[PDB]
Design a protein around this ligand. Sequence first.
Ligand SMILES: NC(=O)c1ccccc1
Ligand SMILES: NC(=O)c1ccccc1
Ligand SMILES: NC(=O)c1ccccc1
Ligand code: FES
Ligand code: FES
Ligand code: FES
Ligand SMILES: [Fe+3]
Ligand SMILES: [Fe+3]
Ligand SMILES: [Fe+3]
Lengths: 446, 446, 446, 192, 192, 192
Amino acid sequence: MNYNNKILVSESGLSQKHLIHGDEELFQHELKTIFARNWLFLTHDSLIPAPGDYVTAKMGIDEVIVSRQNDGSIRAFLNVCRHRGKTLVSVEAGNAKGFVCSYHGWGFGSNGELQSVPFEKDLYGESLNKKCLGLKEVARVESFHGFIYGCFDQEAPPLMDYLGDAAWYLEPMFKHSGGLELVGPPGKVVIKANWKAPAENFVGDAYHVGWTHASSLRSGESIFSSLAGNAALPPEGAGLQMTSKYGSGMGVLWDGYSGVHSADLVPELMAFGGAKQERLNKEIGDVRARIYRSHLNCTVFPNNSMLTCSGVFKVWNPIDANTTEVWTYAIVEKDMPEDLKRRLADSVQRTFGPAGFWESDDNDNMETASQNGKKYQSRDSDLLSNLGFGEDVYGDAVYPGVVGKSAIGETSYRGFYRAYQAHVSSSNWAEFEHASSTWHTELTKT
Amino acid sequence: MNYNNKILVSESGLSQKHLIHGDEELFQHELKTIFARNWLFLTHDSLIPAPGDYVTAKMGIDEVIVSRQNDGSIRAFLNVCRHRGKTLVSVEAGNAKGFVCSYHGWGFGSNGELQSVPFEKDLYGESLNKKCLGLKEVARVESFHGFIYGCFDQEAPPLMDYLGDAAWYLEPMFKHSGGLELVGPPGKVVIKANWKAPAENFVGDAYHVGWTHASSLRSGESIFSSLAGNAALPPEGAGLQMTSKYGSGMGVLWDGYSGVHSADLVPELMAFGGAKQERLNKEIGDVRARIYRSHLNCTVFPNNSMLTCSGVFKVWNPIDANTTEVWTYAIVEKDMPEDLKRRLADSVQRTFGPAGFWESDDNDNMETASQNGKKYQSRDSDLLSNLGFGEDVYGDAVYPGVVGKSAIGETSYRGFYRAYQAHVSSSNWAEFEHASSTWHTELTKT
Amino acid sequence: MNYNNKILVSESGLSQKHLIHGDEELFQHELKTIFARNWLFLTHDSLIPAPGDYVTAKMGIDEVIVSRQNDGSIRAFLNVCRHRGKTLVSVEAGNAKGFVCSYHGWGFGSNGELQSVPFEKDLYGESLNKKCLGLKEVARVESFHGFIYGCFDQEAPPLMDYLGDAAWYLEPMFKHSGGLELVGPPGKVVIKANWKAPAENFVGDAYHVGWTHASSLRSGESIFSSLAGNAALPPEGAGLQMTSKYGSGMGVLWDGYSGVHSADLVPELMAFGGAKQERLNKEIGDVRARIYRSHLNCTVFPNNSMLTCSGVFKVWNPIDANTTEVWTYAIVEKDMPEDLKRRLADSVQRTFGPAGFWESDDNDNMETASQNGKKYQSRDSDLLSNLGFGEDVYGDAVYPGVVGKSAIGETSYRGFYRAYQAHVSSSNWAEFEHASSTWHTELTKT
Amino acid sequence: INIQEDKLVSAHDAEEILRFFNCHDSALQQEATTLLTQEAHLLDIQAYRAWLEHCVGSEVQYQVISRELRAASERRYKLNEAMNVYNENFQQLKVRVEHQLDPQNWGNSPKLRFTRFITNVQAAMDVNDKELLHIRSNVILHRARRGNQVDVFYAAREDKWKRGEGGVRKLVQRFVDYPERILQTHNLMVFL
Amino acid sequence: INIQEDKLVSAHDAEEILRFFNCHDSALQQEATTLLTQEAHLLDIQAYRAWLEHCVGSEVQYQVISRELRAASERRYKLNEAMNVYNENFQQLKVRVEHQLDPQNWGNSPKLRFTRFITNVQAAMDVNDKELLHIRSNVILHRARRGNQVDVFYAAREDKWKRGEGGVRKLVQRFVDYPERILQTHNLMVFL
Amino acid sequence: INIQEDKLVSAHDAEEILRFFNCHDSALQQEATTLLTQEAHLLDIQAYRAWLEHCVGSEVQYQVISRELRAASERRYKLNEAMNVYNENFQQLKVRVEHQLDPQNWGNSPKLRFTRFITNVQAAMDVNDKELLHIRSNVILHRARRGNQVDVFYAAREDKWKRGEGGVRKLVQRFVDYPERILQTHNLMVFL
Ligand SMILES: NC(=O)c1ccccc1
Ligand SMILES: NC(=O)c1ccccc1
Ligand SMILES: NC(=O)c1ccccc1
Ligand code: FES
Ligand code: FES
Ligand code: FES
Ligand SMILES: [Fe+3]
Ligand SMILES: [Fe+3]
Ligand SMILES: [Fe+3]
């Protein structure tokens, strides 16, 4: 397949070829044009707070070690020994001044430097240039209010700019709330779906909630529960959708601070969020204080998703075209009482973790949609994302980005796939920028 | 590999490259030139007799829904939602007026039409062209005496013509017997063989029976039992072999009406078939009435096989070059007493079903022959099908098709692979016809 | 990938691209340029001593039958029927005058000839040319002191010449000791590593022993035990390393006759080897008699490895780029007391067999190093083998080959990969020879 | 069990629960455990004739079905719900036993290896036939052959056992509803 | 057990050993076996309401954890060691039961098939609460659905059971430390 | 069993049947079940020193073989039929135990997880050595490590146990003929 020419996503992001969820050659191409190029979620300050603390993380199919340096910065390195290529670290988290390879005992510092080689003097003499044998370092590591992302491509936009118009919506909860903590360790489960299936679902799919999650809505008693079995369409102006230049997008459901949490947490959460909102009106204004306590279903392009307020934080780690390793953390507000944080974390896993009853509702949807992309008669068929097209705006006086002023639609699908197609057909960031110079115009046509 | 030029099957079908049972690129090419082009077995009238009845079936690696329409016709559709591509139907059989997708709730009629979309007015307004969003329909669906086949290629010959000279042999049992019923549900088992290995075996392999099935012949006491351990060669004129233009072929074993059935069913069957034969002499003549009660081992090209009289009906559903999903039904004559039908169905599964002791004898043969096609030193080696070559005839006054007038030979292998090579090297039906304009001459050379 | 041009191994064998352990296209290319071209271990005289005795063996991914002929020679044949390609022999060892196919009953002699075809006269008449239907024969089969190797390429050097300078080191134990026996049957285990990972480890890796095998050295009490946890570097001149034109190489650890064997066998072995050495001084000289009772860690290119004295004999049978089937035999000296042979064989399996505690130490090293070769950021990274470079010699007055006069280094890695690169980039033996005309000069540069 | 409340429970399954929850006889559970362990031992060593002689009653029905996948809400489609993978009388079992023992059963060379794990044994006497013992048990069956073929089967077995010749308890009915619809074990040519 | 000598043994595991190695009551082991076999039967036939009614105490904590992989020699990093796959009280179990039984649970059509294998049962009365029974058992759980999906779960269960309404023994605590860190079963939506 | 009639049965297997079909002692089966369940518990928590101390006799032979695949009709080829995956005396087991516990056993970090399922227990006293207990049992052993590595082992075990120090019953022989010829579990570095 010629990725320069092949139309995998139609103009305005209106449709995508079904093969994108199944084609292994395209998966391999994504490793280069998506995962080696873009910002990927690594960890949170709360998981590596002290010097020497480290975790392992995936970046695409590569594994990295993410380490807190003595100076308070964070650096990340390929989890691969520079000698004969053995995996250096076999655990998920810990604290250490360095890492010793179990094959021939080469010792690397927390700063990636080759610090010791067994019997170096007797064996290599002065001939080993350890200075050039440090671990292969992730070129870019940056923080968004404690959330740490990495990028293998030195040419990438800074993380703040990459978030584009999505950052404005995230800030009330990520910044003005006083800050969030990530509660680990994550649940980890493999699903037989393409990474794009859950990514697209979280970025912009409210349409599925009432039908897919009918049983969870009916059984759990959460605040979104009127939707069960498509019994009720949300009121006018119940929310909006947005998308951005570099692919990130989200839905906003006004006031839905208790999110998917069962009735056992609803009154406490609605009290807590409302109280903080009242304080925030004065500092960031009524609209943004309201956004703070509104449910956001977001994907940070390409494969990190979240539900704020519900507190669900996901990484869709790619394995192959029909295999994805799902990591699930809980996010909580730092100033919440500790007992509430504990119960919120448990409730995140109860609903969206490895035995998450909500998350289970989505399984067959993601898996079969992905696997059907391999089937001969479906490869060249068109997946539709046209709901709401022709009603999106850009440059609104109140809400930034390409925005659909309706709770349910496919605005965010279109922006996600516009960015995806621009990357798949480009050789570097400059070419992506050239391919994106009219991004919002394309999305708001008609 | 260049499929226009590569000789995978030698002239006259005398040999085939062993790689054809192992090469995954060729498997992918077969999805286009074999499975998307030819007639494939779907179901029987007896399994979907009433309006609204449906089953799911495979066509190559694609899955389809096969539905009885209100007007009595049958239509078939890809089992894939037109929205975001989720698998629509998760069951094997049922009765319904339509199918609702569990992702976003789109509702399709039994006629494939998009009939309802949740909240269409509020969401899409009048902008959704449901008329163009019906399920992707199988272009051609036709019946041979109740047996329903489908074809994705509108340009295919009608099913009757596609059966060619094989139809004459099938008619006494399929038509003049009063009609057959398919007894479901089928057994379903995965074997690690290429779909062509059992297809070729059923189309034309009597040579293997005495040796491969020695233990089953000795243990079961069926009428073909003299063959056990190659103890006895069938008498002269014990049967014949035939093949046809479009690849279908079969062996005929004269008078073998009780087939593989153990001695517990032999006298009853031999009485029943003989009695019907006596009535049929008057209507269709002695030769054809005899064919009715003669055992036919047949493949309807490419991947549907059967043993008439034994009542075994097989679909060799392709998964990859060394994986095949085997579906096994029983066929019975409609006018048989119900208790005999029940016992016959059980006996079909006893011998050829998931725990079929006969079918188990074939396992290692099919699996290792297929897997050896991946082995480096065997890929370019030649599988032989020359037995009987130079003794076949065409245009015989009594028996139509290319015919080997002997019970044991490889006539039907040659016709099967001649048609296979003509398809693999052709881009469409017109090219197959051009490649087949001297089909019988090629088969009867020397 | 263009294998004529792609530099997979840098000049002097100093580094290799990590993709060589993970790339499936390269694996397929190795089947042609490595496994179909070179000498591969089959069996030992001791396992097929009598006429009619046979074993099955792998040669690359192909399986062969290896049979003792009536005249005392050994011939080997593809384990694939010449009719429809079924696997002929399903057992690992036995005694027979021939092999009958379980599909249609064709009978082949122990000499590969098609000797019988069921009902040949009645079916084929005189038309079957059985003379041209013998099993596909391995072109070359030769012995090194009872150890039988095969090669599919008629153009290969004789096995003695192929061993090159490595033969000199093997002869004291393989020849002058009175001869070795292989004790079967082998242990068989699948590991998720590339075949090159254990091959390179056995050919030239002493550096890993102290660290990788720290726990086994500490726990087992063998004579190499001072090395545990890198507690002690071997004394000066404790050994050497060598490599050869066609890729075979080894390490020599002086006097280490009891090898990896636990203290329960040390005194008996050290007595036995010392006593034979004393007799050998007179016949082959002091240096070579000492080599006899010195521990050799050797790979016979490409995928047969051994530890003499320890008595470990390995075949790394390739399955795919990250799968290898490991066969483990014990080697013993024929004139050892039978009870010692029995205990030595058990100790070989105890340390290096399927539950070998030493072999288990290597698992993660081999598997992760191999699997990391598939990871995007590591494919184009460089595995290092520069230890000792610039200190190797060729043409030494006492020790032949390219020789590193130190116990620990990477001399043998360099020779192994020099030969590998020369084969991967060559179409036949003549081209390998042309690519190798300055082999030792390349290895001894600087 | 009220199956109008426990919506996922079949009428058949609810009846079988009722059988075991009532009278509990500890000694009977132990007899049943012995019976099944000995049966499994005979099968594992491929003593198929001994199995017939010692474990299987002359009036046996040995049945394993495969049920077609249908909608949970299905009420109209009423064609054959299942097919019989096995539905054997004693003579039919004997045929299968002879097929296993035949020296030209090429698939049995080299010899197969079987290992059976029997768990969750429950036993209750029949209410009406005081000589009929109902035994329920679950089996994991591991079959290994030819170096690298491994197939693992999983099933629940509903048995009836009755004293026959010599007072020996023998199998008069086994029923298994096989839980996997599409077999991924090459075949089901094992005695569950 | 001395965990300073048996270096690989956790303090928690050593304490649980001690519980069962002391007093052995054969009758109690048999009661425990019956209790667990009946519980597994109810779960296998998807009688989830019956399971709650008959097997689960009102004060239950039903907990399955997943422990982060850490270095054996780790002594400094002290953040949350595990997450809760399950950590349910009775009402939370009821929510999950209603979710299973809901007729719009699309994933339950066609009906799933469960087969549970319970082994290695040990039982001991609590030293201080003479009405509290500790039961340990291991489970293999086979879940099959939709033709060719098969998931097999493996776990050890640390239970406490206590007599409640009507003198019926009911589960008041189940603890499982799930042995596989990354699930390869699509989800853990089964009751271990 | 007549192995001339039951053609697939080995002489060894026929002799082991005979051992258990004769005298049945229900109490002995229960003792054997306790012994094996406790042994499995110690192994599962990696209390390998405790296992040696409490479960393994000083005179033990601990043997697991792998048998070469040969023709069922083979009568002439008479070379070594099997190799020893394990053939350990007490000191050799101790070496393996120390290897597991060594802090530089890098493969044991992060800590492995073991779960054992013991079934099909049979026990009989020896006819001649009234102090020797024969115990047969089957094991499924699940080993999980490093996020996504899972290996499952299946075997039948022929044991002899004898009262030693303090009257504690200890293992004096274990024999396993491993059923899979080519291991697909990376290694067999587990105590079956
Ligand atoms: N896409 C989602 O999971 C979602 C959940 C809750 C509300 C809105 C969207
Ligand atoms: N190919 C067959 O299965 C066959 C069976 C029975 C008779 C003839 C052929
Ligand atoms: N490479 C090895 O396994 C080795 C073992 C022992 C001594 C030297 C090398
Ligand atoms: S591979 Fe890491 S030190 Fe050699
Ligand atoms: S995928 Fe079917 S309704 Fe959306
Ligand atoms: S395949 Fe061997 S005789 Fe036909
Ligand atoms: Fe959802
Ligand atoms: Fe056959
Ligand atoms: Fe090693």
